[PDB]
Design a protein around this ligand. Structure first.
Ligand SMILES: [Ca+2]
Ligand SMILES: [Ca+2]
Ligand SMILES: [Ca+2]
Ligand code: NA
Ligand code: NA
Ligand code: NA
Ligand code: NA
Ligand code: NA
Ligand code: NA
Ligand code: NA
Ligand code: NA
Lengths: 597, 597, 99, 597, 50
């Protein structure tokens, strides 16, 4: 008899398809996640004491002493138990915030500001989301991020140096990085970073492969504060997709006729056609020069859960992203996949072709088939957004269940307390001795900047403070530093867009924000940018935006980008079993290679 | 021994979870879909002929004769085979468009306009997407929409009457439905519809339960051109979520202090805070009074695949939705889940609480837990968008594989050809005799309107035309009428938002668009609206917007809303197996009952 | 009782041996293959054109212009579809050779 | 919903394909193998003895008495146990060879020759390979060869008669079968065989179907010493594929241009183009007239494992196969599939089309597809060779585990010992009384031939010897007679070639070896030969070559050919599950019917 | 003339070649290929004969 397969009912074929996807995901196998060893390394310095200090672990929310160390190690150990359990009662039983006033029930803060506002506590954000399963994509726990840099490492010294330089550079305009007005500060930043081993010495044979991949070399004006994804380091700092508008309704080719939108100019003034309405690329303007958590008492209150969310002031109106601070503001409130949905909307409005390896992409006289639900606009619009929560589950597992890395503000706190004590001949937090020793010039500028802030904030004669100034009143979100929710979502979403579109398409005209006005200008850049390059740059922009706000380090962002890419790839692989058509996605990966899915 | 369960590896638990969700979906069982019987009912009228005419089936793209009937029945039968196969070669082998010129290769159109533009054909949009499986939610083919109204039915006569009245009413402002200047036309519309059996007589015992549920009664100014979802018929026509902006960045409560955004007024001028940028609710303005496909030759060219997409003209600028036409324009280009994502962004910016049956929604001093990835903003932002493509697969199956209902333009074409022939004592398309007989008054107004259009378009003395004027140059999309992509997505997305938010929250201030200027005014409405009511109204607004454009009938939209609700419910049910927490979504359904998932 | 294994028929032992070898091969797992990224990198140089050139891809057999670049990108895209399908009709429908 | 099947991962599809092939093989079921009953029939003639003699079983290597009967029945019974176990220790524990000298450790032989060479023993060749499984094709034990002829049967008398006539005819040239100088001997052979019941009487109703199929009728010059596969009995004795060369590199058609190899004549002088190098069809020349094991002591030494391998002498140079002995030499050393690989190389060089039921065999302008890995040269080159070891496992099972038939030399030994004893009025080996009684004229010629050999070997007055002269110094390989390794491989390999090529293609010019010189001449055959016929003839040539060497009987070869065909068919059937293309192999089987696989 | 650098793809590192000499010109890099004559014995020598 002639070998054959057999039909079965539609319902059984649907069942079997979903099982076959689960089996494909299971058959990938899983890998363990390794932490950097700090959590039980650092000990309470008190001689009569056998406890870890947890000083390099995220402990935001648990009660801290006057130096920023948690008071009771059991509070962190219970937090770790609750993270791995997910049980709601166990979470509700944790200790959050400092002692409360018997009469009012309110937390008793250290700072007059927090007490005057009568702030309440805020809680951990889904501390067990890393336990959640998903109907599609790699399970949250099946994949790994490598160990985070340690406090004593050249890599961390380099990272924290960079974050202070970003903080002190928040009023620098992107379009003026290379301008004479900024030369003294920009060259100081470049020289300081080039004076650090991480940047001025290469990795050595035998170093962790993850370090080798993410290690950076000579700092230049062309790479200062940039990411390392391919495309990020070519052309203007900001991706086209975060400043340009799109083609507008009314501009069209109809047979041999070209129609021109009466609103065509909106494209070059930051308006994305969003269906028949618009998105403006113009960002709200946080008060220039105003940073937060520059006072130790306010800093400790924030470390003890004081809910400063919403405390920022702003100027009227909105502008195309102009300064480093503006990119920080952009990433303070962006809605999940926002940057990438907006890029997708630009690509669609501008008619950028889909990946030519998808079906039905020829002119309809040849294929008799246009695209929408599958392989067209509706398909990409759903797929780019759906990957975000799957990527978040995976990075949440790394954040809370594996690494629990302290946020940069907490590292700044250790540095400040250390330096202040050292000035009085006392050793506190020797773990950050190397950063204190090497970053003296930067820390002196921070001290001056913080005193000015603390005077502005109403303190007539502030104590010296070397804290890392925060762009946000509440500092980091209420979850650990490693990895990043923003960066994992960036990695997943730009993976989808690069795969779905023909991402080798070259950008026709390159723009930047004008030096003198709130408008776009043609860039003087004289190479070629591609859709893929500019999507990578967009991911790097949102990710580094968090760094510029003071809330992540370089390694958090890059390793999270790689994790997000894996999530999106896995979703595409599993979904490939659902279609009858003969096609694949061509995906140029962050490592420069291409996978066909 | 004490009864127990047992742990297994995380990877196996993930696999088993996904299998259990597939088994839950399989265990729902499936239902068949029944079509209305027209496809083989109507016969070619030629005496020496044994073919169906397919006149009540969607045949857009297949070559039509001078009366709008397909020329060769095999063209439709092959199209049906291709729909059920999905094979790309078989699709490419179909006949699309009319005969082509040997020298230029271009289609030879009937109209001077299509020939002068040298229009090419456009192809069917994923004619086999109803075959695609999905990793989550009910399989596309597992659920059903009931048979569509037949051409000879009271329901269809009522539907097509309504669409002509909407077309001729395109310049009426929503804010002025009850204004003296519109009284003549509005009362004509109301009286005409009240003259029709569908609206003036109730269903009878024994009628199909689907007809009973969707049948409408007495037409009033308060219900004219509205939907029937609960909430749609109360208060202003347009949902708050399609005209109001949101709370803006800088407005916040920080402990005992209230901060006010410098941009607070933008909320009342149609700006949605979109992260740290904005969406404008102001829609592009299609040229008032310009309709399309009012000439039979141009109409037939469109029926024969002539690609008029992009041919509309616009006035400069943008305004809050003002006229019926503006809602048509809104739904011409909206991006998949756009309306509902925008409503979600309003609800988030305004701080509307999530469904209180989710975990962690108490003040953090009580639960030590805030929400983001699960049960918070990122969760809803992904879930509202991801349901869209699953809902589209299901409605595509109904559109192409089951019902293949002709679009309203095609019904208008039958009516026009019929009436013109009857005036010369000939019977053509007797299937629409009842509509022609009952809609004389409306058709006379259409004739006058079409003559004016045809003169404006450059024909000094046009033949009489009773065609249904289209808001869009290309008329309907290249896919069948029943159901609707817009309406199925509306039903799925608002189902998600009603479940995810506390959708019993009452609206504080109700706005409408001003009669005299492009701004919002406080409504004089005196009752109470809820989030759920206004989300239902939004779904009905997008869905009826398609009707007002001329591209769907009432039944397409309502039945599609119900299908989308089923898809979203099923996704929520399957996803419920992925979480460790104790919670459920409370969902108020379109039928007035609540399901807890 | 003393632990043991059991005999079965020769035919079942042969079947089980062949299944065990298939299981061994399955249990090795699989690895993806990554291409060098050129296929969609290089673009048609004509300004009014949004196609890849495919100049670094094998296109022997597809019709080429006077410079050795393929004339119609659809010919290579169809070739790639046929490669992944294997269907004989689809292969026979490709464009092979010059006009 | 529409019935469907579903995709799964490639790895699972590969697994399932391999399981489906195993299941197809299992579903064929199995058949038992029946032996001829002799092993326990023939008894030790000693009155006080209850042991079988095993005289009709292969016992080469176990120690024999002066009559050629094994000394100790336990030695054979242990050998049978070891065959069924395969255990290496159990094999090493067997008795091999005669008593050894205490001082030197060397076997003590009967013959001065073996003692002077100090020969060691040789061991059984994979006595348990019939236990080995295979990843493809029918398991070794699933199929059967029928019971072998018994010593007392007309069939055996006929077989052994034929082998003696071949031995005594070793110097006859194929080209001269019909020549006057050979008429006396050729007619003697024909008349002697026609005097035997097997050939002069037909099978009778009720005889075993296997006997009916293989029974031979009237012997003629045209069929003398030939096989019975279809094609073997038409045209010249030797297949074209064992004497002709092939088209040479440089001969080709390029469009309308013909190129001619500068060495084109090599084709007609026995050179096969082997890639860009060559194979010569010219065989090494064993010393004419020198046969072996014609002395009883040397014969018994060989029966007792004396390793005479490599003892033959040769003339200088090489020639196209000329005599019967040359075909014996050809099959003494041929490498596994050599004959059939060589035929395949001729067919490829000559451009013989592949089976037209394979895919892609049309001109490339029609199918856009040439062949290599699948359905072309590389495919057949691997497939023709890979079947060999699978065929060997199956015949090894029949050889050792089932039938253990004595090799022809051992039958000749029984005949010689019997006849010598009978001349002295003693009865030894009455089992071969019928052969002795019926073959007197042949045995008298053997006696004369053996005396001459024994004189040449250095015995001036040898005892009478009626042994079957061996072409090879060591006689048979160290494994049983039924079936044949050469013949099972021939059957499997020519089955592959007939299926893979268009084996209905007719041979254009037929050649034979010249009577006078070492060259090819045009045959005077009139008639048509086909590739399939000449491949069958090739199989019969290699198989009968073993008979002409003295090491197999007719029934061993024919039944082995059938077994090999079954092995190859089964491999093709199981492999058919691995391809996506629509095709089959058309195979003309040895029975004249065709199977499409 | 320049070696691979740390961080290069491992496949490049394994297959990268160094200084060209007459002894390695046009040769492969399998172990054994770079020692003795260019051509394998097995493509020029015959064998022991019957
Ligand atoms: Ca197309
Ligand atoms: Ca809470
Ligand atoms: Ca071919
Ligand atoms: Na596009
Ligand atoms: Na690409
Ligand atoms: Na280009
Ligand atoms: Na008819
Ligand atoms: Na918002
Ligand atoms: Na609710
Ligand atoms: Na050859
Ligand atoms: Na054949």
């Amino acid at each position: 008899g002639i070998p054959a397969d057999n039909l079965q009912s539609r319902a059984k074929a649907s069942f079997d398809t979903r099982v076959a996807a689960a089996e494909l995901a299971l058959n990938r196998g899983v890998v363990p996640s390794f932490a950097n060893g700090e959590e039980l390394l650092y000990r309470n310095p008190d001689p009569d004491n056998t406890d870890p200090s947890f000083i390099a672990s995220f402990t935001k929310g648990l009660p801290h002493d006057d130096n920023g160390a948690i008071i009771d190690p059991d509070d962190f150990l219970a937090f770790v138990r609750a993270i791995n359990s997910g049980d709601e009662k166990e979470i509700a039983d944790l200790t959050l915030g400092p002692a409360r006033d018997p009469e009012t029930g309110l937390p008793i803060w250290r700072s007059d500001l927090a007490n005057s506002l009568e702030l309440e506590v805020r809680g951990w954000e889904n501390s067990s989301a890393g336990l959640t399963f998903d109907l599609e994509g790699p399970d949250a726990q099946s994949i790994a991020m490598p160990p985070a840099p340690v406090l004593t490492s050249p890599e961390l010294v380099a990272e924290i140096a960079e974050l202070y330089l970003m903080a002190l550079g928040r009023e620098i305009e992107f379009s003026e990085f290379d301008s004479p007005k900024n030369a003294e500060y920009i060259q100081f930043a470049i020289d300081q970073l080039n004076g650090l081993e991480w940047f001025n010495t290469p990795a050595k044979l035998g170093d962790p492969p993850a370090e080798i991949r993410r290690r950076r070399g000579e700092v230049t004006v062309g790479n200062l504060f940039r990411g390392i994804l391919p495309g990020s380091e070519v052309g203007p700092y900001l991706s086209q997709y975060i400043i340009v508008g799109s083609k507008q309704i009314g501009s069209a080719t109809v047979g041999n006729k070209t129609l021109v939108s009466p609103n065509a100019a909106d494209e070059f003034d930051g308006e994305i056609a969003y269906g028949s309405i618009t998105i403006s690329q113009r960002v709200r303007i946080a008060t220039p020069g105003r940073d937060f958590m520059t006072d130790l008492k306010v800093f400790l209150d924030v470390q003890d859960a004081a809910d400063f969310r919403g405390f920022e002031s702003y100027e009227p109106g909105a502008r195309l992203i102009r300064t480093i601070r503006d990119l920080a503001t952009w990433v303070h409130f962006d809605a999940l996949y926002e940057a990438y949905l907006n890029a997708c909307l630009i690509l669609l409005a501008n008619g950028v072709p889909f990946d030519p390896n998808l079906p039905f992409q020829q002119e309809d006289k040849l294929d008799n088939q246009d695209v929408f639900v599958n392989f067209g606009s509706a398909h990409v619009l759903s797929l780019v957004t759906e990957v975000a929560t799957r990527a978040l589950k995976a990075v949440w597992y790394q954040k809370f269940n594996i690494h629990r890395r302290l946020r940069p503000e907490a590292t700044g706190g250790l540095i400040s307390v250390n330096k202040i004590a050292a000035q009085k001949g006392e050793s506190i937090f020797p773990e950050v001795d190397l950063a204190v020793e090497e970053l003296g010039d930067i820390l002196e500028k921070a001290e001056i900047s913080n005193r000015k802030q603390n005077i502005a904030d109403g303190d007539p004669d502030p104590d010296p403070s070397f804290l890392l100034p925060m762009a946000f009143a509440e500092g980091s979100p209420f979850h650990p530093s490693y990895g990043s929710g923003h960066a994992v979502v960036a990695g997943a979403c730009v993976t989808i867009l690069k795969a779905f579109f023909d991402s080798g398409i070259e950008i026709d005209q390159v723009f930047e924000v004008d030096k003198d006005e709130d408008k776009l200008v043609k860039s003087s850049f004289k190479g070629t940018l591609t859709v893929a390059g500019e999507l990578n740059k967009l991911a790097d922009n949102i990710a580094i935006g968090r760094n510029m706000a003071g809330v992540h380090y370089f390694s958090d962002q890059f390793e999270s980008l790689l994790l997000g890419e894996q999530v999106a790839i896995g979703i595409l692989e599993e979904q490939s079993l659902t279609y009858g058509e003969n096609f694949f996605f061509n995906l140029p990966k962050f490592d420069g290679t291409t996978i066909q899915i």
